[PDB]
Amino acid sequence: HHDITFRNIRFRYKPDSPVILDNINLSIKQGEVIGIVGRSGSGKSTLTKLIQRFYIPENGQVLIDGHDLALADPNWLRRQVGVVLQDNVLLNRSIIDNISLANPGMSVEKVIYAAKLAGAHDFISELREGYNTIVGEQGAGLSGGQRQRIAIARALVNNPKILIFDEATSALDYESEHVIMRNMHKICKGRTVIIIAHRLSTVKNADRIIVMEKGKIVEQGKHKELLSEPESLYSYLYQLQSD
Numbered sequence: 749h750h751d752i753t754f755r756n757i758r759f760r761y762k763p764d765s766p767v768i769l770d771n772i773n774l775s776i777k778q779g780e781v782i783g784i785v786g787r788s789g790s791g792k793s794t795l796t797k798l799i800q801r802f803y804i805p806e807n808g809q810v811l812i813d814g815h816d817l818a819l820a821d822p823n824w825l826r827r828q829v830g831v832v833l834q835d836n837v838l839l840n841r842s843i844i845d846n847i848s849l850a851n852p853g854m855s856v857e858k859v860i861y862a863a864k865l866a867g868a869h870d871f872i873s874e875l876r877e878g879y880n881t882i883v884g885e886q887g888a889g890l891s892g893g894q895r896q897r898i899a900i901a902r903a904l905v906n907n908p909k910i911l912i913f914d915e916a917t918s919a920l921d922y923e924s925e926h927v928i929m930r931n932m933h934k935i936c937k938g939r940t941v942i943i944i945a946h947r948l949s950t951v952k953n954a955d956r957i958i959v960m961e962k963g964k965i966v967e968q969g970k971h972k973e974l975l976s977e978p979e980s981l982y983s984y985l986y987q988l989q990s991d
């Protein structure tokens with residue numbers, strides 16, 4: 749079963765604007781963990797915007813869990829997709845409010861479960877005010893890596909069938925990265941996962957990597973297979989990021 753399908757997708761942001769995605773064809777199986785890589789502005793984030801129907805393509809179809817998004821319930825779609833946002837933790841609000849910022853009338857139990865998957869529960873639990881701690885500066889002083897785990901918990905809380913990781917915009921402390929990587933298999937378990945990767949190393953072990961260049965998928969496959977294509981863009985990007 750394919751959880752996400754793009755067929756012949758063409759997209760530009762505005763009527764006059766340049767084509768950003770051109771004839772994208774992609775089929776992602778349920779439970780697959782996919783990495784998306786490529787230079788800045790290749791169209792990686794735009795692809796995920798279309799999955800959420802934030803924009804509508806001028807040609808082609810996006811199908812989510814078999815449903816053409818043209819016809820699909822927008823509320824259902826909102827519930828099927830969880831996005832791990834960058835720099836989106838509200839400082840003026842509690843940790844629990846930040847995690848449940850979609851279904852406010854939801855379980856403390858559901859919040860805790862998501863924070864445990866995210867590897868946040870342990871550090872939250874050792875806070876004077878626990879989950880009621882206000883995130884903000886002089887109000888808690890949570891690190892960027894702590895805030896990122898809260899962001900993961902927020903994405904997981906409603907148990908989405910599809911999980912998307914937006915491209916990393918900063919660097920995380922060793923402890924935060926370590927905890928997340930140790931927990932990735934639990935976070936991704938039972939879900940279709942798309943990771944937009946800043947460093948190719950992040951997604952070395954994804955089921956498949958998709959390589960974008962100038963709005964096109966140019967290459968796709970497992971890491972070892974992409975490195976086997978003699979003049980691949982993947983190999984060049986791999987070389988560039990190497991020590």
Ligand SMILES: Nc1ncnc2c1ncn2[C@@H]1O[C@H](COP(=O)(O)OP(=O)(O)O)[C@@H](O)[C@H]1O
Nearest residue numbers: 761762768786787788789790791792793794795
């Ligand atoms: N909201 C927007 N309006 C107009 N152009 C945009 C918008 N968002 C992104 N773009 C443009 O789309 C192209 C691809 O962007 P993006 O999908 O974010 O690439 P990536 O995620 O690979 O860096 C870039 O030229 C970028 O400036």
